[PDB]
Structure formats: structure tokens, C-alpha cells
Design an enzyme around this catalytic site. Structure first.
Site, PDB file in Angstrom:
ATOM      1  N   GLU A 177       3.968   9.107  -9.127  1.00  0.00           N
ATOM      2  CA  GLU A 177       4.675   8.846  -7.797  1.00  0.00           C
ATOM      3  C   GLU A 177       4.797  10.552  -7.559  1.00  0.00           C
ATOM      4  OE1 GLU A 177       3.558   6.967  -5.376  1.00  0.00           O
ATOM      5  OE2 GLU A 177       3.878   5.190  -6.166  1.00  0.00           O
TER       6      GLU A 177
HETATM    7  N1  LIG Z   1      -0.488   0.609  -9.560  1.00  0.00           N
HETATM    8  C1  LIG Z   1      -0.429   1.591  -8.463  1.00  0.00           C
HETATM    9  N2  LIG Z   1      -0.522   3.134  -9.142  1.00  0.00           N
HETATM   10  C2  LIG Z   1       0.365   4.066  -8.924  1.00  0.00           C
HETATM   11  N3  LIG Z   1       0.225   3.871  -7.057  1.00  0.00           N
HETATM   12  C3  LIG Z   1       0.537   2.575  -6.512  1.00  0.00           C
HETATM   13  N4  LIG Z   1       1.525   2.416  -5.571  1.00  0.00           N
HETATM   14  C4  LIG Z   1       1.450   1.128  -5.636  1.00  0.00           C
HETATM   15  N5  LIG Z   1       0.890   0.292  -6.516  1.00  0.00           N
HETATM   16  C5  LIG Z   1       0.305   1.761  -7.537  1.00  0.00           C
END
Ligand SMILES: Nc1ncnc2[nH]cnc12
Length: 254
Positions: A177
Site C-alpha cells: 500500500e
Molecule cells: N493481499 C493483498 N496484497 C496487497 N494489496 C492488497 N489489497 C487487498 N488484498 C491485498
């Protein structure tokens, strides 16, 4: 697979930022320019180099994360148990034994375990057993010191689902993120290295990655959207106001 290491034994804001840039530069296709912006875009999926390995290096051990280069989705993690035995835990629909063997060589086939829950936040959050507020990941906060604490819950210890789930929630947000959203990266470095409160804006960014990417990809000219957009935190006219770090691959611009 290629591996980048985050030194948590001697952390610095600059090191964290360079670590995120290494992730961005590894997966991006520099020939891709979306909506006339300078934001990095993930390249088309590779059949050869499918995964990336991230190492969280601490004073008492190292925990690793496996991410899919195609979309930065976390597919697995490595941690030593109470008997110092390396063990790999993976999401079923995300990776195979042979690939896991190549990603985490230090783990033998017998020590590869398939996680009982899904890779989506909802599934992970339910197993994290957060008891306050809306009981979502937002309730845990963010930060380097928080990541260190979460790693302690899985590093050289018997597997406890609650602790594993909380570690994953923080690890995913602090890597994948943060790579996608500079707003998240900036929050971490601004509060470095302390734990701090998360915000609705953080969650809003996360759930709108695809929508933001699509908007810049097909409804944005020279960094200016063709119409006003609102992803939950207010109206946005210029892509720069989104402080994006990495856009989702949607093909070559037309
Ligand atoms: N496993 C994951 N890795 C990265 N971003 C995500 N967004 C939702 N699930 C995720």
C-alpha cells in the site's frame, strides 16, 4: 526471485523510502505513461519473474514477504517457529509449491503450509480479532515501531492466527500500500519511527486503487481529469493531488 531488505535493526526514514522506490522501480514499465502523469505504472504480467521477496531484518531474526510483481498482492510469508525451523505460509490461489520453493529456498516442502483464510483484507481482519471501533485494520494504526512489534509476534514463535493476521495487515499496508500511495509513505516518514493513528483517507485510498488507476488511464489529460472525481475524501481535479506512487497495469495508453 529478486529480494530487497528493510533493516529494522537500525531504521531510518531515508532507508524506508529507498526501499519503497526499489519495489516501484522493480515492477514498473518506464515506457508506460498514464494520463500524461509522471507516476510509475506496473508493467504487463511476466511468465518468468512472477514474484518479489521482501525481507524484514530485525536484531533477533528475519521475516520475509512474497509479493506478486503483476499487482503487488501479498502471496506468502516466511518466519521461523519456536524451534527455529523456517516455515512458509501461503494463500492457496496465489502460488504453487514449486514457486514457493524458488521464492523461499530455506523452507522444505513439508514446512510449506496453506493458510486457512483468504488474502483479502476482510478475511484477514476477521482472524485478527480486533475488538474496538469498526474492528478493521484502521484500528491497529500504522508505523515502523508498530511493524517491529508485529514481527515480534511471528518471529521465532509458535504460530498464533490472531498474531499472524495482525502482522499481515500491517506488513501489507507498510509495503504494498505504501508503494502504491505516497500519502501513506509520507505519513510513515512524517511520524518516523513512531506508531500513529490511521485515517479514513488511508482506507479510502486502498479500496480505490483500481478506480484511481482507471481514471488516470482513460479520463485524464496532462494530469488533469476530464471531470471531477471523489474517492471518498473530497473532489479531485488534478492527478497530482492524489500523490500516487504506483498505478495498476491496464494496458498501453490509447
Ligand atoms: N493481499 C493483498 N496484497 C496487497 N494489496 C492488497 N489489497 C487487498 N488484498 C491485498
Amino acid at each position: 526471485a529478486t529480494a530487497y531488505t528493510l533493516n529494522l535493526a537500525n531504521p531510518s526514514a531515508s532507508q524506508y523510502s529507498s526501499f519503497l522506490d526499489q519495489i516501484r522501480n522493480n515492477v514498473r514499465d518506464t515506457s508506460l505513461i498514464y494520463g500524461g502523469t509522471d507516476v510509475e505504472v506496473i508493467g504487463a504480467p511476466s511468465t518468468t519473474d512472477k514474484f518479489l521477496r521482501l525481507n524484514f531484518q530485525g536484531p533477533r531474526g528475519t521475516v520475509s514477504l512474497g509479493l506478486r510483481r503483476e499487482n503487488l498482492y501479498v502471496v506468502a510469508y516466511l518466519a521461523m517457529d519456536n524451534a527455529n525451523v523456517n516455515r512458509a505460509y501461503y494463500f492457496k490461489n496465489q502460488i504453487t509449491s514449486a514457486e514457493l520453493t524458488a521464492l523461499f529456498p530455506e523452507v522444505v516442502v513439508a514446512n510449506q503450509k496453506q493458510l486457512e483464510y483468504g488474502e483479502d483484507y476482510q478475511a484477514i481482519e476477521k482472524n485478527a480479532k480486533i475488538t474496538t471501533g469498526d474492528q478493521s485494520r484502521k484500528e491497529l494504526g500504522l508505523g515502523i515501531n508498530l511493524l517491529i512489534t508485529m514481527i515480534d509476534g511471528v518471529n521465532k514463535k509458535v504460530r498464533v492466527v490472531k498474531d499472524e493476521a495482525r502482522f499481515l495487515l500491517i506488513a501489507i499496508q507498510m509495503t504494498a500500500e505504501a508503494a502504491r500511495f505516497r500519502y501513506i509513505q509520507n505519513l510513515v516518514t512524517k511520524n518516523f519511527p513512531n506508531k500513529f493513528d490511521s485515517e479514513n483517507k488511508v482506507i479510502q485510498f486502498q479500496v480505490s486503487w483500481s478506480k484511481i488507476s482507471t481514471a488516470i488511464f482513460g479520463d485524464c489529460k496532462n494530469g488533469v481529469f476530464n471531470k471531477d472525481y471523489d474517492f471518498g475524501f473530497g473532489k479531485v481535479r488534478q492527478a497530482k493531488d492524489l500523490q500516487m506512487g504506483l498505478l495498476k497495469y491496464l494496458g498501453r495508453p490509447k
